[PDB]
Design a protein around this ligand. Sequence first.
Ligand SMILES: Cc1ccc(Oc2ccc3nc(COc4cccc(C(=O)O)c4)n(C)c3c2)c(C)n1
Lengths: 10, 266
Amino acid sequence: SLLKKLLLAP
Amino acid sequence: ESADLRALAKHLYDSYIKSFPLTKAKARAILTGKTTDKSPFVIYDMNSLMMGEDKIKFKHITPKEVAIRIFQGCQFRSVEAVQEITEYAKSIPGFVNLDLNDQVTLLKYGVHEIIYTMLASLMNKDGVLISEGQGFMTREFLKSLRKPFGDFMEPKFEFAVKFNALELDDSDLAIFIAVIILSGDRPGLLNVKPIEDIQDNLLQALELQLKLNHPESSQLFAKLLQKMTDLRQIVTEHVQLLQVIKKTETDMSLHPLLQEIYKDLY
Ligand SMILES: Cc1ccc(Oc2ccc3nc(COc4cccc(C(=O)O)c4)n(C)c3c2)c(C)n1
């Protein structure tokens, strides 16, 4: 998901 | 230890400053004219909205009737806000160690409540700051927009007026936001206890922050816990107006990040 991608990016 | 709770409070405030470009302190300085910075361009009618097309800059590049352009504008601001809040959430001790799907869940159900909390900081009774303080759109002009859009933001101004009367500062707000994000009762959480334990410590931090920062207002903590419940109601009203719009109108484009958050959101 998009939210997951935002959470994973330093 | 109370010392550790103050250290946590300070960590959250410092992270909050890092994560959010326009703080309440700076927003208040603008709204009251205390700043040295150039005055916001005031959008108070269709004509001034047109004139503002030049003056005001948006971070997103975009090479429809007014009511729709404004609504889409709030969309894109909300998209920016979700990313800022995500960055803040990740600074809360313990959060990045939670199950990743639970992190997604906390954000999905938390972000709008945080958006409207922080939007208040940019609001007074007469209007709202837009684009990092570059512009100021009047409450009356937004109210004057054709239905359903004239009612889109009024619920939030009404919330902000009462919320701002509590006179929280950025230090209070950082902890207040943290508590909300770490809500163990969001739908579909898998591992509740670690979230509850984190929130319990944040709540202790908030209680001590308010006791020290607002010595003469014993009731403030209990009132803020109620405002958290209230914020969920504001979000419910918003979601329902969102469905009305999504139908009362021939379809516009909804940003996919918002589409993802909206799914199963009430
Ligand atoms: C030149 C120009 C100026 C403004 C403008 O429209 C805009 C753009 C961004 C804006 N941000 C806000 C903050 O309010 C918000 C913000 C986020 C969510 C909500 C929410 O209620 O969900 C309300 N308003 C009100 C805007 C209106 C356009 C299109 N052109």
